[model samples]
Target: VLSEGEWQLVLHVWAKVEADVAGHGQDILIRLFKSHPETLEKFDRFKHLKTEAEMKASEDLKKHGVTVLTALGAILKKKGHHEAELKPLAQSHATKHKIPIKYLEFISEAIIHVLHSRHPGDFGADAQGAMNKALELFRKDIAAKYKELGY
Candidate 1:
């Protein structure tokens, strides 16, 4: 999904951001819920954080956001070749959780926004494109799992 140079760029950029992934991850998810407020309703545990402050106050949102972002960071750490590691998550989300696969695309976009905003200095267009390419590959894999699950 990425050339050697682009992969290096991803590694460099992610290194700068991983230290703060917890904060940025929570921000990304908060922005996600803000854009699709109803997404929060899907998680009865995380329903209706009407304001960013209220969201910031939620332990569930913070813990889960950090957990997710940290996992993605770990994948990036593997140079985007960890599809096998993510397959179970994809299958379960598609089948057990019944989350629409389309949401993964939305998340790809959200991750781009959060990464760029967090470290615009490290996020040149080339870097962004590389990151997007990597994310697109991940999304495709997840979508494939969705189809396999009859979703």
Candidate 2:
């Protein structure tokens, strides 16, 4: 859960890069794949990408990353009322994608890493903590949906 101050901090930091969601989203996914190559297996379109350049040049990855970032933005905007919003996505991943929850955790890690790298001065300890708190709850909600779906 996030307090009012935490929410404000997260939003403030997010605002700095929100203008380039597409680029940053792709950057986050690339960072995630760099750290956890196995995550690529979850994406049919990206699974065959054998090099960093290939990943970077992937239009599919670009599109999917944008979608993911947009969804994350929606989730943040909804905040405490995100359960409804997460349900469909959680169910789809649980049933159709069969993706382990860890990858979502990995993506969260990627998001923080990318943000910090992009804005070293702004994304400091306090911002990281706030973002982490928010993502933890987001992950929890999705995991709950997975359980409810019998995954």
Candidate 3:
């Protein structure tokens, strides 16, 4: 779904923050929880951190956030061919965490919105569209499989 230009934009721009997976990931998750506190119930480790600071300071949040960001980084890299990669993770969350998978929609919302707020360089409409298009695999391979697992 992403154009060539869109892919390039997302890949290059996201690479800028790839090293600080901890900070970038935490920043995204902090904004997510801040905007949707109820989503906190999904995490056993970081459920109680309601405020932005409380969430930001959480090692648990950082850990999970890093995991998520790592996945995103991988997805961005393999934008059009990462279906195989999402399987293990999608199954893991469904089986262990009981994450509904539909939450990926909200996740996309938080990720795209927050990143836009960060004014990530020339990352504009094309970048956001690329992210959305990339999320299609996540929703299909991950979210759809969650249902397939009957969870």
Candidate 4:
């Protein structure tokens, strides 16, 4: 289980990711760059790309990322009807990123940042536990996605 502070941090990150993708678009990579300009120094692709292509691709990716995050959030909020919405996109992201199964953590962290900033006082040990459980479930869900896609 996570400590209260840890859980709050998690929620904050999750919320941030959600807001960015929801309002900005799904190209999370681009969102990260926008949010943290310093990251530009770390990624070669960002440095070498033409301005127009970079902007366009980032917008497209943001749209996709936002769609996926929104769908996942609905599922998490007990809006069961959206559960199936994640299948195809999760599969595609897994393949496109060439990641094993841990990429879900990155998304979760992003959400936590956003949530923390919005609701600074709504955190405690129980909230942290909830976050831990939520993240565990999220990981399981992603793993299932990989299995379904035979990745």
Ranking by TM-score: 2, 1, 3, 4
| lDDT for each residue of candidate 2 in 71-125, tens digit (9 for 90 to 100) | 8888887766897789889988999989788988998999999999888787899
lDDT of every model, 2 decimals? 0.81, 0.88, 0.75, 0.55
Candidate 3: regions farther than 4 A off:
none
> Residue pairs in steric clash, candidate 2?
none
Per-prediction TM-score, please? Answer: 0.92, 0.95, 0.86, 0.53
Off by over 4 Å in 1: none
- The residue-by-residue lDDT of candidate 4 on 60-149, one tens digit each, is 455655666776666655422234755766676677655555445655554444444554565444555566566666677768888877
- Residue 44 lDDT in candidate 2: 82
Q: Candidate 1's residue-wise lDDT over 1-151, tens digit each?
A: 6788888888888887778867887888888888776577677778866788999888788889988888788777777678777887887788777788677777778888988988899998989998998888777777778888788
Backbone Cα, N, C clashes tallied per candidate: 0, 0, 0, 28
Model 4: per-residue Cα lDDT at residue 49: 44
Number of the top candidate by TM-score? Answer: 2
Q: Once superposed on the true structure, which residue ranges of model 4 sit more than 4 Å away at CA?
A: 1-65, 79-83, 96-99
Q: List the RMSD of every prediction in angstroms.
A: 1.4, 1.0, 1.9, 6.8
